[PDB]
Amino acid sequence: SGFRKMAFPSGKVEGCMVQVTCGTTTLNGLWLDDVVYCPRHVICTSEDMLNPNYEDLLIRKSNHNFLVQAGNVQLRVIGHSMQNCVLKLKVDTANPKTPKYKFVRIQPGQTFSVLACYNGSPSGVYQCAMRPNFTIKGSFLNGSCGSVGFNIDYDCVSFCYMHHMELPTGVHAGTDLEGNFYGPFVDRQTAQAAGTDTTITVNVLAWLYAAVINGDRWFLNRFTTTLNDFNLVAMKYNYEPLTQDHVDILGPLSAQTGIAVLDMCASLKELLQNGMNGRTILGSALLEDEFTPFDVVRQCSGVT
Amino acid sequence: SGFRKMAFPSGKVEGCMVQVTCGTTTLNGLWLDDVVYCPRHVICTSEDMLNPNYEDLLIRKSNHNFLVQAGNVQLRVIGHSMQNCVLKLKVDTANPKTPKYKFVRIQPGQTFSVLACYNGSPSGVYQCAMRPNFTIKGSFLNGSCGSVGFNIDYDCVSFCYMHHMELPTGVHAGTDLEGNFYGPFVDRQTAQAAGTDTTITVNVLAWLYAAVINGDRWFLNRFTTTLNDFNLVAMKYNYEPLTQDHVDILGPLSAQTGIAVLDMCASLKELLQNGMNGRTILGSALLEDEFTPFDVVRQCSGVT
Ligand SMILES: O=C(Nc1cccnc1)N(CCN1CCOCC1)c1cccc(Cl)c1
Numbered sequence: 001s002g003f004r005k006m007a008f009p010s011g012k013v014e015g016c017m018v019q020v021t022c023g024t025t026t027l028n029g030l031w032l033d034d035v036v037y038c039p040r041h042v043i044c045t046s047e048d049m050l051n052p053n054y055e056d057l058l059i060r061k062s063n064h065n066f067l068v069q070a071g072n073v074q075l076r077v078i079g080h081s082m083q084n085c086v087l088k089l090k091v092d093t094a095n096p097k098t099p100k101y102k103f104v105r106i107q108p109g110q111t112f113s114v115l116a117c118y119n120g121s122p123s124g125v126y127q128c129a130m131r132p133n134f135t136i137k138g139s140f141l142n143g144s145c146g147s148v149g150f151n152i153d154y155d156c157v158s159f160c161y162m163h164h165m166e167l168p169t170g171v172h173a174g175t176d177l178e179g180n181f182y183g184p185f186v187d188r189q190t191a192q193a194a195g196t197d198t199t200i201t202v203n204v205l206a207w208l209y210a211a212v213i214n215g216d217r218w219f220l221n222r223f224t225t226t227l228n229d230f231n232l233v234a235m236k237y238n239y240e241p242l243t244q245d246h247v248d249i250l251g252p253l254s255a256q257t258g259i260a261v262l263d264m265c266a267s268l269k270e271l272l273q274n275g276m277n278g279r280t281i282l283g284s285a286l287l288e289d290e291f292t293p294f295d296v297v298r299q300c301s302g303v304t
Numbered sequence: 305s306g307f308r309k310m311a312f313p314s315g316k317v318e319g320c321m322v323q324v325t326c327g328t329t330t331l332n333g334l335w336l337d338d339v340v341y342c343p344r345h346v347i348c349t350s351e352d353m354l355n356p357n358y359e360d361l362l363i364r365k366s367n368h369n370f371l372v373q374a375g376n377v378q379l380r381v382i383g384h385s386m387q388n389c390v391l392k393l394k395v396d397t398a399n400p401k402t403p404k405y406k407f408v409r410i411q412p413g414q415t416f417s418v419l420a421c422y423n424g425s426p427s428g429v430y431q432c433a434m435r436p437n438f439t440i441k442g443s444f445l446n447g448s449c450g451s452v453g454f455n456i457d458y459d460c461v462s463f464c465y466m467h468h469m470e471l472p473t474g475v476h477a478g479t480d481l482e483g484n485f486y487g488p489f490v491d492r493q494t495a496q497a498a499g500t501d502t503t504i505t506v507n508v509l510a511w512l513y514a515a516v517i518n519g520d521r522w523f524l525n526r527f528t529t530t531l532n533d534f535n536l537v538a539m540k541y542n543y544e545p546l547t548q549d550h551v552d553i554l555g556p557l558s559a560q561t562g563i564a565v566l567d568m569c570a571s572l573k574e575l576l577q578n579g580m581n582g583r584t585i586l587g588s589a590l591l592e593d594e595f596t597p598f599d600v601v602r603q604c605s606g607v608t
């Protein structure tokens with residue numbers, strides 16, 4: 001019992017973190033096999049960020065200009081290339097701690113753990129979600145760029161995020177491990193405003209199922225609704241529309257609890273319309289949307 | 305920017321987790337040097353939990369009855385002893401992944417990370433606080449016993465908690481690594497009700513300072529208060545009394561923000577008396593108390 005915002009164990013990713021320095025700029029890199037992945041803005045100074053021509057800036061850099069340090073030992077850079085917004089630094093030594101891994105591009109609404117790092121050293125681990133506006137609400141300071149987001153399936157780490165930027169509104173933007181930004185963001189110090197941060201409806205429902213499994217049941221009501229009726233309410237409250245694909249993914253949670261998905265939608269509809277009335281659900285006074293249906297089943301069943 | 309419930313990187317602790325089985329009972333153990341630490345109730349069956357005489361149950365156990373497996377390899381048990389509510393299993397091999405470590409007994413209000421495990425395998429990591437009633441609000445299922453709580457200071461892991469029990473109310477109880485329970489709990493399947501779960505005032509203030517550092521400032525008011533006046537309000541709302549020791553510990557946060565501790569107390573007093581009025585602070589609709597002043601400085605400065 002109990003339900004917590006749980007991150008994956010970070011050990012497998014900690015063994016991959018390195019420090020990358022180019023000139024006066026230092027950030028984090030991810031060392032997998034004989035390649036170190038890092039944000040391409042490591043080649044810039046704060047002044048270059050205004051309107052950088054990365055191809056032109058990169059022409060002035062050689063392998064020996066990229067200083068890669070794993071722990072306290074220096075890695076030898078034997079090649080460098082730019083792929084989208086990341087640099088790939090080929091080193092002469094395969095990371096002996098390279099776990100089984102994949103690079104995945106996640107969809108909005110999906111969750112992942114972040115290992116925040118500074119100077120190639122881990123500071124902490126927390127759970128995030130890719131927002132519907134393609135930002136993440138993280139905890140990152142200057143020097144945290146290159147910190148990664150990931151999921152783990154038994155022994156395989158699926159890397160999904162690399163931190164690049166903080167928007168003037170305090171939310172974060174980054175790329176997948178192929179260097180493509182999530183959303184419309186560009187690696188430039190320019191006016192980039194995020195779109196509507198809508199609530200991830202399917203995740204809120206999964207969290208309401210987690211609440212019922214853990215004894216928090218006050219919000220269950222005598223009502224039901226339809227997808228179309230529920231969606232009229234969801235639009236009004238800036239919630240993502242619920243689809244039959246979302247209902248299907250909630251199937252195992254519905255089966256475990258005996259609460260039909262549309263009945264849970266009617267509970268959610270009343271919570272949106274009436275509020276919490278000073279009450280809490282799983283220690284929260286707001287509807288939590290950064291737990292996927294898979295996260296709920298995983299935590300509630302004890303998957304290792 | 306951004307402020308998250310952040311756990312320590314768990315790698316150093318993941319290298320210590322082992323599976324301990326005695327008869328039909330399997331739980332987690334912590335392997336440090338040549339000793340495996342685990343809850344003494346590994347020697348019981350669910351039926352024995354009603355009123356166990358651990359010294360008597362232990363007489364029927366020999367070294368070969370404790371099955372210790374680290375990953376997929378078996379450890380040889382060459383000694384066993386009981387210290388309070390934990391068993392210490394001496395093995396013939398020192399854990400090669402033993403980090404620098406200490407065993408500490410924490411005070412209520414202090415926070416720590418938990419590496420939830422099942423069958424000696426890590427499932428996830430989350431941040432907890434030792435509540436003022438000596439329970440923790442964790443996320444633990446059957447099989448999670450022996451999972452540990454810890455803090456890290458650069459390269460030294462300070463272990464502070466070992467999970468033993470879930471109370472009928474869904475909150476958790478456990479011991480320090482010397483096997484002494486936090487609070488009045490006993491390792492028995494008996495009526496054990498937790499006391500008042502009061503709010504950790506000094507932590508709420510530290511979190512309000514984190515909110516100001518991150519731009520959430522709507523709650524700052526034109527008022528001040530005194531320790532005695534603030535404490536009259538804190539008693540009414542089941543908050544822990546604030547002492548001059550708490551004010552002193554908030555000194556660095558007060559200096560960084562220029563907001564006097566007693567002025568922040570007056571903001572907190574108005575928040576307690578008036579509520580949030582449907583507003584949020586650092587993405588929360590309630591006053592968060594599981595961040596210490598040290599956690600705030602650490603996260604806000606990027607300590608690795
Ligand atoms: O957002 C950033 N950093 C940051 C700070 C807080 C939290 N998360 C990230 N930067 C700063 C990068 N510069 C490069 C030159 O040396 C100095 C650092 C940034 C600014 C604009 C576009 C991009 Cl892609 C990145």
Ligand SMILES: O=C(Nc1cccnc1)N(CCN1CCOCC1)c1cccc(Cl)c1
Binds near residue numbers: 348349353
């Ligand atoms: O609380 C417990 N487990 C648990 C479950 C969910 C979350 N956290 C912990 N147990 C069960 C232990 N028994 C021992 C025999 O084999 C079967 C398991 C327990 C019950 C009473 C006193 C103590 Cl110390 C422990």
